Amino acid sequence: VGGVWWFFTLIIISSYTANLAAFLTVERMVSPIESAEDLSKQTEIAYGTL
Amino acid sequence: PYVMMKKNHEMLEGNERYEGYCVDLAAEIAKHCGFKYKLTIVGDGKYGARDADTKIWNGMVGELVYGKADIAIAPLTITLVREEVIDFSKPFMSLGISIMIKKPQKSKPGVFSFLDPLAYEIWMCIVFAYIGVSVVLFLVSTNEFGIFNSLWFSLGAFMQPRSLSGRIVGGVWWFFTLIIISSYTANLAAFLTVERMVSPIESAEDLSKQTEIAYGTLDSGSTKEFFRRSKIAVFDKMWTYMRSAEPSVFVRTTAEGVARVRKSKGKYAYLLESTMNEYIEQRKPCDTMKVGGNLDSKGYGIATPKGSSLGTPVNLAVLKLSEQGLLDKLKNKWWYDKGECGAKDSGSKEKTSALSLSNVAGVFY
Amino acid sequence: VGGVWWFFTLIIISSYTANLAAFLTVERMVSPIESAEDLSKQTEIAYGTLDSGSTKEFFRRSKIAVFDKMWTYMRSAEPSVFVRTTAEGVARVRKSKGKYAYLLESTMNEYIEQRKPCDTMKVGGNLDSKGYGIATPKGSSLGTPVNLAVLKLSEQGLLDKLKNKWWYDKGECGAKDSGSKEKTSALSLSNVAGVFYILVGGLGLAMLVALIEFCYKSRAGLFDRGVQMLLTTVGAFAAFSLMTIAVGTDYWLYSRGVVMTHSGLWRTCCLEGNFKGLCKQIDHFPEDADYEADTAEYFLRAVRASSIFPILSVILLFMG
Amino acid sequence: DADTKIWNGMVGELVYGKADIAIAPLTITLVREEVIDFSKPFMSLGISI
Ligand SMILES: O=c1[nH]c2cc(C(F)(F)F)c(N3CCOCC3)cc2n(CP(=O)(O)O)c1=O
Ligand SMILES: O=c1[nH]c2cc(C(F)(F)F)c(N3CCOCC3)cc2n(CP(=O)(O)O)c1=O
């Protein structure tokens, strides 16, 4: 019971660690528009003129 | 998207009422051949078949043979049966039979999301070495005395004095498990960062080699008749399956087929013309995709009455348009540009993140 | 000591784990191509066409978005991305380790994929729609007949059959395509295996110490106590002497730059063609490297101070 | 050839009566369709990677 419970918590804490690494990796992946070419390369942010 | 009724078609007249690939292709042909034209929709709304009994042609091919029209600009397939009665210009669009499945990318936890990061082969060896250490320690410390000890070394196995021998064993085994759990953690993080979900495999041969995923064609048409008459290895087996598959793998209309693929959770594939397929992929909710290359080589062409004056001119016009990349341009305009879906844009969209319960659940059971 | 050592190993194992993750995260990031648009969106993988032919002239005259950019690149790409013959192009793809792509007719491409050593593959659909045909003199008698014949052959699947006969069946490979299926796509046992061997090695070492230990016990060391002191003293003296020899090793680092440069803490030397060596005796080395690196003073030289201290401490220890 | 305005290869041997028919991977181009006759395509292709 102590062994299986240990293996159980091992997986969870490993999952938490791995997942938390991903939330910071993706947090860096996000890039903000720096030029016009950035408006054409993406579609999430709509844009227009007069 | 070859010929469609414009939005405000009720407020328009003449050729302005229609819009599409062929509508634009008409203007182009007319420009290079120099002539005015009047776009008209075929009565019966058929392409070009021949009733065996009455021996009468119907649809566009019919209106050509009986002098109802001067030329046919539509997705008319270039077939031998038609080439005999009318004239076909060179193909303005090559196509064939393709495969349509559900939208790629899925889910699923099944404690099997924990055995994946760590390969099944690795889970095995880590268990073999597991008992491989509990047996080595067992030799360190009459029949029952060996059982109580083997259960104690198995408890020293189920992980957490100075007998140097078994001492370094516990240390090395600890360093061993340390590396593994570190690898599992690191690898699982990669998984939680990229998180790419592939799918099956494009290859009509893949549909024949398996049975889990059902598949069929239209109950009536060249598509179905193709497999029936096909003497090719792969396509043969496919037909044999569809011919006796229950329930019926054939659908009434093309819309029904697409609906069956969108409601089977990827358990049903639909075989249809690549042209119409590619178009469907660019329509909401963007849950269908074409896989693998075409099964055969076909092609549409401009049909003109046998021995017509527009014959040669139109033929050259088609060749001229293709070389100027005007044909490819038109297709891109109505298929992808005018489209709404997206595949290379969904992969270019770097954004997502959130934990669920599926994977963690497998460890609870 | 146990606490600080624990905090020390904690940081290391955390570093190992984190670092191992980036190598696996990027390992997944890698996305082979698949379309022509992929060749334009990137530059790491060079690509070109035949220096002369409809293939090259296609991109030049093409007014299509993607193909336009591609031509712009190939038009001024250095070195020349264009090859003399088709054989040269294929050879360039087989010798660039996947750094060079070659654009050619699908027909010839598909055939190459079915030829040894089966190291080439076609990716994505065609860029344009072409087609071969039977040519007959204008206004010939064989005109119409042949035309219908071609249509008849295609409908009977005879054309498709012929292609399969000479492209895929004629092979051959026929093996390199079954391995290209692209089945595998995960981690691996390789790396983990290395940790298994070091484990069994540790178990074996213990199985040796066990027997050895037993033997020792049976025997039961007093001899060493007497000659052990003398032995340990001379071993220490030998180690200290060699430490001093190590520090002066006219070779603390060699910075190849074909000449040959080798340095220690005292001299910087150079061996010129051919064989003649010269040294610039300087003695230890803090110089004007604007290092600092953000404190004040200590290095270079700091290593001098630690080595000198070590030898002085070792002398006092040897004596006492 | 732009200068001599002479056809070469198979397409040439057809226009100058050297041969009766050409059965080969001859591309169906506009420039050729003007001087000779092309049957329907017996093999559709294109430019690949
Ligand atoms: O000349 C012909 N041109 C055709 C053109 C198309 C389209 F692609 F939609 F333009 C289609 N569809 C494909 C998808 O399913 C719905 C309709 C069928 C055609 N058929 C009937 P076939 O006998 O099944 O080939 C012809 O005869
Ligand atoms: O009618 C034509 N048919 C052709 C057929 C083929 C092949 F695919 F090999 F059958 C090729 N090759 C493709 C690969 O490089 C080696 C030769 C060139 C052809 N060309 C020359 P283009 O001017 O470069 O198009 C023609 O003119």
Give D-chain residues touching B78 at CB under 8 angstroms: 40
Distance of alpha carbon B15 from alpha carbon B17, whole angstroms: 5
Interstrand relation of B268-273 and B4-5 (parallel, antiparallel or unpaired): unpaired
Other Cβ atoms within 10 Å of C128 Cβ, number: 21
Tokens of B142: 């009459």
Please, what is the Cα angle at C246 between C243 and C249, to 5 degrees? 155
DSSP single-letter state for residue B298: E
Q: How was this structure determined?
A: cryo-EM
Chain C, nearest residue to B180 by Cα: C192
Tokens of B19: 């819009």
State the greatest distance between any 2 C-alpha atoms of chain C, in Å, as a whole number.
Answer: 117
Tokens of B90: 């060179």
Give B-chain residues touching D34 at CB under 8 angstroms: 316
Q: Does D27 touch chain B (CB under 8 A)?
A: no
What resolution does the deposited structure have, in angstroms?
7.8
Under a CB-based contact definition with an 8 Å cutoff, are residues C262 and C269 in contact?
Answer: yes
DSSP string, C31-61: ----STHHHHH--SSEEE-BSSSHHHHHHHH
Under a CB-based contact definition with an 8 Å cutoff, are residues B90 and B319 in contact?
Answer: yes
Q: What is the dihedral of CA B149, B151, B153, B156, to 10 degrees?
A: -140
Distance of alpha carbon C118 from alpha carbon C176, whole angstroms: 5
Q: Give residues (CB < 6 A) around ligand 1.
A: B 47-48, 75-77, 221-223, 254, 272-273, 275-276
Positive or negative CA dihedral for B62, B65, B70, B76?
positive
Give B-chain residues touching C151 at CB under 8 angstroms: 78-80, 83
Residue B212 CA, ligand 1 centroid: distance in Å: 29
CB within 8 A of C178, min separation 6: which ones?
none
Beta bridge partners of C255: none
Distance of alpha carbon A41 from alpha carbon B342, whole angstroms: 13
Tell me: cis bond preceding C174? Omega within 30 of 0 counts: yes
Distance of alpha carbon C45 from alpha carbon C285, whole angstroms: 45
Q: Looking at chain A, which runs of residues are DSSP E strands?
A: none
- With 0-12 CB in 10 A as exposed, 13-18 as middle and 19+ as buried, what is B74? buried
Other Cβ atoms within 10 Å of A21 Cβ, number: 22
CB within 8 A of C195, min separation 6: which ones?
B176, B179, B180
Under a CB-based contact definition with an 8 Å cutoff, are residues B251 and B260 in contact?
Answer: yes
Distance of alpha carbon C205 from alpha carbon C253, whole angstroms: 36
Tokens of B84: 């005999």
Which chains would you list as touching C if contact means 3+ CB atom pairs under 8 Å?
A, B, D
Which of A6, A12, A26, A45 is the best mutation test for B, with the most CBs of B within 10 A? A26
Q: Does B188 touch chain A (CB under 8 A)?
A: yes
Other Cβ atoms within 10 Å of C219 Cβ, number: 7
CB within 8 A of C67, min separation 6: which ones?
C36, C58, C59, C127
- With 0-12 CB in 10 A as exposed, 13-18 as middle and 19+ as buried, what is C155? middle
Query: Residue for token digits 């030829």?
Result: C115
Binding positions of D for L-glutamate are 25, 27, 32
Q: Does A9 touch chain B (CB under 8 A)?
A: no
D33 → closest Cβ in B94, B299, B316: B316
Distance of alpha carbon A41 from alpha carbon B350, whole angstroms: 12
C132 → closest Cβ in D14, D25, D37: D25
